[PDB]
């Protein structure tokens, strides 16, 4: 099944990419925010923390946009499936090459 | 004597209660085990009182 497999694989790979985003520094000197706090003072390491915040915000925004587009496509497919049910299943449809 | 690639506790080097004298400069004697260094150099010789 191709249609039912893409909607799961795409979500799983989006979640995996979201997890992978936390392994990057986004141009900072470390990936985990605890390391810079333990090795540098908070007054000096503020800019690295803020850079990490901006990177995580950008990744989350991109994930939200991708999920919104996927949800719109799923909404369109669900409307199509509901119409197909109400026409071909709950009666006989005169539309040729639709059912 | 060179101490390398080894784990060593200095607590047993102090509870002997047999040393006539003991001096340690550059670090507080009660807070040297937790501090980590690279190499330890030990020299042994005899001397008068």
């Amino acid at each position: 099944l191709g249609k039912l497999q893409d909607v799961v694989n795409q979500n799983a790979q989006a979640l995996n990419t979201l997890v992978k985003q936390l392994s990057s520094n986004f141009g900072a000197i470390s990936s985990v925010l605890n390391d810079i706090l333990s090795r540098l003072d908070p007054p000096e390491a503020e800019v690295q923390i803020d850079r990490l915040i901006t990177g995580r915000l950008q990744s989350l925004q991109t994930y939200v946009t991708q999920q919104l587009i996927r949800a719109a496509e799923i909404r369109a497919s669900a409307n199509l499936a509901a119409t197909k049910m109400s026409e071909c299943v709950l009666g006989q449809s005169k539309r040729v090459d639709f059912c | 004597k060179r101490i390398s690639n080894c784990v060593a506790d200095y607590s047993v080097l102090y509870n002997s209660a047999s040393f006539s004298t003991f001096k340690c400069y550059g670090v507080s004697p009660t807070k040297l085990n937790d501090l980590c260094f690279t190499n330890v150099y030990a020299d042994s010789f005899v001397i008068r009182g």
Binding site: - | R2, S4, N5, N39
Partner: protein, 287 residues
Amino acid sequence: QCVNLTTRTQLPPAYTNSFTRGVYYPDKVFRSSVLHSTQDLFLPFFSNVTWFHAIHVTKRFDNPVLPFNDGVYFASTEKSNIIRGWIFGTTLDSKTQSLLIVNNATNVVIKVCEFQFCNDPFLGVYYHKNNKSWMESEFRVYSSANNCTFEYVSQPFLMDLEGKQGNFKNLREFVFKNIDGYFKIYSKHTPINLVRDLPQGFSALEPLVDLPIGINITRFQTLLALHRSYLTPGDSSSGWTAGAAAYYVGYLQPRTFLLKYNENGTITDAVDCALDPLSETKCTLKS
């Protein structure tokens, strides 16, 4: 102390092809049922590589000072423990910290120092008359030593000092690396019944000891052991015997490798990304 050899007819080195060899664990973590790709120095698959002989039947004895690149692969189909160990260094003139990783009949001895390394150190085994056992007597590995800071012994390792001319029964692979001065050892003994053309089977390499030395390294050379029986006159000029052995030396290159971790936690396959377009397709899809 060491002595010089005499010129004789030798054999030129040959070139052989690897078959899915030179794969080790790049880290010390546990991974199960995951295809994880890492950037680390491994041996590329399917590549022509130099091969060195050690058989007597003639009089083949070649120990060149090969350059030590960023990681080497040392595989040997050892049968009667003819090989002993390895030495390292840059100039071998008691000016740098030259390594000496040897395996004596009682214990493994690892000590990096500034040994006065000769032109061609070797291990000499003498056959006693009243005793029917092969015993090592000529310990000519260096002239002298001055000072060093590292020495490691580990557990005793027992080997057989009797050399034969039969087919090999064991295969030993070694990988030596130096990252940030940290010395890396990877080895795994694998039984096999073959003389040449290493099998296409897969076998990972697990680390044994991890040495924190932090020194320089650019050249390396292996050590060999010859026998002095009643047939040879006993002089190291033209008459000797070395049994039958063969060791392969390969140079590691930085390539991304896709490892296959099973549910048990061991590597099963090492599909590449810069060898074949099919392998690149496999490792880009992570499948």
